[PDB]
Point group: C5
Chain length 273, copies 5
């Protein structure tokens, strides 16, 4: 069957199909995904006034990100269930092309909201020392955009052209490393002149940021992480990818947002944790 | 017809089918489910300022849980009606696999929000005495997650492998008992140093918590509670399961949330009740 | 064909079909239904601060009821259009079972929100004299639930078993009379020690309550109110039922809520109308 | 084909079909419709505190009307696209009865919200002199309802029975004239003893009211305004009808609401325009 | 296949079909579109109180525009996926007419909100010097409407009648140039008597306005910008058009709104940036 430049889910779906567990789990984890985001939207709105005025833009940007992530994860949940249909005879879910091919690209372009806003929002909580606000913001946003767009092109080829997949991935990675570099700088300057309590939180934020963001290129590579005809080039790999996205999404957006809120409280003149 | 690792609803649906009453009731009770949750969302938002600032996080977390539960119960309501279709010739609803198999697993993974947040939220109303806040929270969250994940694996096998069903269920149960243990401690420490009115409420909360949470493993076992080829391995058991979920959901989320709100009022310096 | 324990709409739909007017009107009146409820939701939220704090729970409970009623009436609007499909050859809408049978039972189980909350909410406006708050509430809620549950069982049989229909209906009626009894008591005690203006409103509330609530058993019986093979056992009776529900819904929920709000204003120490 | 008592859209749709332009425009204009209403909902909520408390009920009722109109226009937009399907062979959209016949009656019954509330809401801005508040309200509401109900019956016959169409239309018209009469009285009494600024606005409101409300019987007659086999008994007439509704809807609801808000500001003791 | 007065997307879709990348990208970019708008809605509401009262109408009108754009872009996202269906045999998406033809006309009529409101809203932030507020508003609104309506007629013919396409486009362009003229005047008068910081922002607003608004006629012409049978009369041109719309939409609505908000802050007597 002729699929072209399509994600590997569609190939598994079209040949082997998915077991009840594989299909249902993938559905469940996406559903949990979008549920978490809408719950988070409510949380961040409802807690705006828990911090001093100057910090409240962080709450607002969290909320912005929640909207994006909800809409996407919801749309993608539906895309999953439309793309694969139960076959009675064998008792597995197979590619139903009338529902469109499944594509992870939805996530990527929506990152053009999430990434810039997540990177931006810390700059409303921490004070920089030697770095300039506008400079950091511009570096974040440029490298963010390039990271995403290059990756986005990559993933179309994850089956059809493994070379293009890896080369685009590599280029993307370069921009990723730049972001890591700049964020580390920000975190360090953030720590300067604040309580030990706030410094502990920023330490935690950095570890959360580093792990959670790294999951995303993890999900990129997922089908191939056990090499050719490996364990992960299978319904098991499909499950793994969406699990990793969901963990990454919750970590990088919600928990990140919560920790920033907690930092904002410690830095607030009225309030205490 | 090969169904595999699927819930028992699909087996009843595929062999006997469901009567008008069985199909419609199941539909109605899920609808009532999600209606209750959205109504609850409104209630908890609209009553935030009925309690002192420090208590208001309980209202917010109630609201968070309402969002999760609404989304899930709504999604599951639709799943029910898509999965079973009327057959004119016999006048019963039968498995329609084009709608996907029905699976209760949606609930389980969404509990990864509900359970942690419900356990968490009491710690914003009551003061601990001998226990440490972070300790209780960590025990709740770890045991919560393990309870859910093990159960989630179990339920896939409730027909296909009765042994796996029961063993996973048993392991889950161990974690459940731990939670019960910790919550009892919390309730007792909560009672110390507060009005008799607030103590009465916490007494009620404990009974509500104990019954409502125990319904959930009840629903797990439901098809087998009258043994093999029992009364409950039938459309009657299908109805019963979703009824029990809905009672449990309303009790454990809404009423629980309401009682905590009432406790918060009694502990509030301004307010009376 | 074999329909079983199904509402009479499905029997009309399956034999005679519905005319354009009958089908469209039923659709229109349900649509108006849910529109009214969402508009009411807005009204009750937006007018919360028009009354003293102590009265504001009445506004909140109105809002709660609006959410329930919206969701249900919306869902039921869609159920109507899915259940009956145009036949080109004869030019009438006939039962389309692929859409599920139509069932009024959706309403009934959602009353488990509406009824308790509507009865409850007056107790936040009026002061009782000789009666106890918790006593009245418990009687309302118990008799409410029994009324609904017994009726709910009844209506499944409105075609399939006329005896069961009437017996369950009769039992339901007993609990209805109890509620009427208790509400009358409440209204009388409410009138004691308040302005003539507030007393006039409570007089109006009682008449509204009595008529509007009585429409509901009216809708129950509707197909049979002109006896066997009567005028109303027809598409005309189908129309009539849903019209009566919608009148009853608007009266018993919205207008009731509005009048209570007006009462709350007169009893409010700052406020004037 | 046998269509029965159906709107003329369905007859054009069933015989000639609709061109790309006719089908798409009708779709676009309904979409614009419901978009305007939801935008208006936001506007009216967000501007509540721009006027003195006593005037704020006008904002609230505007908002109520917006909800109704949104829901309806949205529902009707979907009805349009479901009712007419592209035929490849000829390249026109034809009646698809599996989607139900299109009916304008949805609008009419929703007017049972819109009309009463629009007429009501002015009575919260202007002061009457010689007329009684409750008297005007009752006349508005009675004549409103009769206007709508009679018209609603009429439009079912606009093809099937031209006599009934015109007679019901005529009766409706009588009630319309009564409303015009009463509104003129209200406007004049409104003008008495208020600033020149407020008087100018009421002058504008009257012209807006008169034109916008008259469009609605215009849309009623639309197919026949060029007589038999005229220009307008065609896809061109279908387009025209929905355009006129949309102009009327925006004028009679949104702009009307805006002008009243502006009047409320001029009459407000705190505020300036 | 007879398509008639239809957009060129449908012709590409009906002959060549779309590759995975072309179909998916178009879907992704529209999704990002509507996501951005809903996020923007939240932002503009949540930041109303960040500026002095007099400026807050700009926030409200931003919000209004967000609602319109969300609804449209959402609706259009769905229209895309309904209009083109995967063909298994060749592995390309082809026109599926059961989903309706795709038409960009949805956008145009919704501009009847967006354009007037965007032009209007600046007049609440800047002070005019030479010009009259009502005069500028009327010129904006008249020329806006004429621009849109003429363009709207044009685009129906972009394939079927290239002459009509270009003539209507030309007429539209005339009105566009008028708007540019008036806006330039506004921006210059805005700069007079305000801080250098606010002047820099208005400089930026002008460049943003000029580029972003010019993209829209760009998208109009897109298929023909490489002449006959050029690179862009292809799936590549389809992609390009929707990319350009989305860039234009984000720029002209969100970023424009953000910059105005920033200007409002600098002009605010309480607040600083
Ligand atoms: C700029 C980066 C472009 C990379 C293109 C690419 O990797 O192409 C691989 C080649 O087609 C393998 O056969
Ligand atoms: C089936 C069961 C129906 C569930 C009932 C309501 C669901 C909506 C939640 C609304 C909860 C209202 C509770 C309430 O009114 O309590 C007031 C409180 O005692 C003073 O603060
Ligand atoms: C704390 C972490 C739990 C770790 C392992 C649990 C292992 C439980 C797995 C039980 C599987 C039982 C089974 O597979 O049944 C054997 C046979 O098929 C029946 O007939
Ligand atoms: C980490 C998730 C581990 C998933 C573990 C899945 C175990 C499933 C199981 O217990 O096996 C039952 C089956 O019937 C025997 O073949
Ligand atoms: C309520 C659920 C508990 C068990 C349900 C009670 C048994 C079903 C009630 C019933 O009406 O039985 C007839 C059959 O289920 C249909 O025709
Ligand atoms: C739980 C309540 C169980 C309710 C049991 C349902 C009773 C069914 C009934 O009343 O119907 C009798 C007759 O068999 C109909 O044809
Ligand atoms: C408890 C009341 C239960 C009432 C149930 C009535 C059952 C009944 O009337 O059965 C009729 C019989 O099946 C022949 O018509
Ligand atoms: C005043 C309110 C209602 C008027 C009641 C009178 C209703 C008269 C309706 C006339 C009618 O229905 O017309 C019959 C038709 O012309 C046959 O060809
Ligand atoms: C409510 C009364 C319904 C009025 C409908 C009567 C009517 O006007 O029908 C036209 C004609 O007489 C029938 O073919
Ligand atoms: C193409 C893809 C790009 C899509 C990205 C747009 C994100 C969408 C909505 C967020 C709302 C905008 C939030 C911008 C914040 C700017 C800001 O806050 O700066 C001024 C501040 O308020 C000083 O007090
Ligand atoms: C002013 C309205 C005038 C605009 C009408 C233009 C129509 C047109 O350009 O027609 C071309 C001709 O039909 C090609 O064969
Ligand atoms: C190919 C394009 C890729 C698209 C993705 C690129 C990232 C852009 C993200 C958001 C822009 C939102 C617009 C906000 C513009 C104003 C920012 C600003 O004013 O700066 C903050 C201010 O200094 C503090 O007060
Ligand atoms: C909320 C969403 C977030 C934080 C997304 C982050 C995405 C990345 C860090 C993506 C990184 C990638 C690489 C570094 C290589 C492969 C391509 C990407 C874009 C997945
Ligand atoms: C709002 C949802 C709640 C409170 C869910 C609670 C779920 C449980 C207490 C589940 C318990 C289970 C067992 C103890 C055994 C079987 C597996 C579970 C997960 C159903
Ligand atoms: C908002 C919904 C309300 C107020 C519903 C009220 C329902 C009733 C009063 C139902 C009464 C019934 C009887 C007394 C006999 C037949 C069975 C019932 C439940 C319809
Ligand atoms: C927001 C909706 C409004 C203001 C609707 C107004 C409707 C009318 C004024 C209808 C008038 C009619 C006639 C006077 C004759 C034909 C039947 C009607 C109902 C369309
Ligand atoms: C938010 C939407 C906006 C700002 C839309 C702006 C639209 C235009 C500036 C359209 C311009 C056109 C021309 C000048 C020629 C072709 C026809 C139009 C309407 C696309
Ligand atoms: C399915 C029935 C389960 C009900 C359990 C009742 C809870 C008892 C614990 C106290
Ligand atoms: C049988 C249905 C049970 C209805 C429950 C209402 C009982 C009242 C208990 C309220 C205690 C606060
Ligand atoms: C439809 C008009 C109302 C009919 C009255 C029948 C009500 C019976 C109530 C029994 C209690
Ligand atoms: C045909 C398009 C009509 C545009 C209406 C958009 C809906 C929102 C209404 C906002 C009205 C703005 C007027 C503000 C001026 C008051 C001072
Ligand atoms: C306290 C407020 C009092 C409101 C009284 C206003 C009454 C308006 C209700 C309208 C009822 C119209 C009844 C029409 C009957 C159907 C006849 C249609 C002709 C065939
Ligand atoms: C100053 C005006 C510059 C605006 C640029 C507009 C270009 C639009 C053409 C579309 C982009 C090319 C795509 C092939
Ligand atoms: C950095 C990690 C990248 C590892 C690249 C390994 C490439 C795997 O090789 C690929 O495996 C597929 C699935 O088994 C096969 O279907 C393909 O034919 C094969 O090219
Ligand atoms: C604590 C409750 C667990 C008891 C397990 C009950 C054993 C059920 O046994 C099962 O019953 C099914 C339905 O009757 C049969 O179809 C299966 O063959 C049988 O394995
Ligand atoms: C108290 C109100 C209840 C009145 C009961 C009336 C009995 C109706 O009798 C029923 O009428 C149906 C409709 O034609 C027939 O199809 C049934 O066979 C018949 O039993
Ligand atoms: C303006 C209000 C009165 C208008 C009445 C016009 C009479 C229309 O007459 C009708 O025209 C239809 C369309 O051409 C024909 O198909 C019908 O046969 C004819 O009865
Ligand atoms: C200002 C830019 C306008 C240039 C318009 C000239 C291009 C018109 O060229 C058109 O190309 C189409 C596909 O490429 C063909 O199908 C048409 O037959 C042809 O007229
Ligand atoms: Na599926
Ligand atoms: Na079904
Ligand atoms: Na239908
Ligand atoms: Na269509
Ligand atoms: Na598609």
């Amino acid at each position: 069957q002729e699929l072209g430049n399509a994600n590997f889910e569609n190939f598994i779906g079209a040949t082997e199909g998915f077991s009840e567990i594989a299909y249902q789990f993938t559905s469940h984890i996406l559903t949990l995904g979008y549920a978490v985001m809408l719950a988070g939207l409510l949380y961040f709105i409802l807690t705006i006034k828990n911090v001093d005025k100057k910090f409240q833009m962080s709450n607002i940007l969290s909320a912005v990100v929640m909207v994006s992530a909800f809409l996407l994860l919801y749309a993608q949940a539906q895309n999953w269930t439309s793309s694969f249909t139960f076959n009675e005879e064998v008792g597995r879910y197979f590619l139903d092309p009338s529902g469109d091919l499944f594509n992870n690209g939805y996530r990527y372009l929506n990152w053009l909201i999430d990434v810039p806003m997540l990177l931006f929002q810390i700059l409303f909580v921490v004070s920089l020392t030697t770095s300039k606000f506008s400079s950091v913001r511009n570096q974040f946003w440029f490298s963010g955009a390039m990271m995403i767009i290059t990756g986005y092109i990559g993933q179309f080829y994850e089956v059809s052209n493994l070379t293009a997949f890896l080369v685009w991935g590599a280029i993307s990675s370069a921009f990723f490393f730049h972001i890591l570099w700049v964020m580390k700088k920000v975190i360090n300057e953030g720590k300067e002149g604040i309580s030990p309590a706030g410094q502990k939180i920023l330490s935690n934020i950095w570890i959360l940021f580093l792990i959670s963001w790294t999951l995303y290129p993890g999900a990129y590579l997922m089908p191939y992480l056990t090499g050719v005809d490996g364990f992960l080039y299978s319904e098991d790999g499909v499950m793994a990818r969406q699990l990793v996205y969901t963990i990454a999404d919750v970590s990088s957006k919600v928990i990140y947002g919560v920790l920033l809120g907690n930092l904002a409280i410690t830095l607030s003149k009225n309030k205490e944790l």
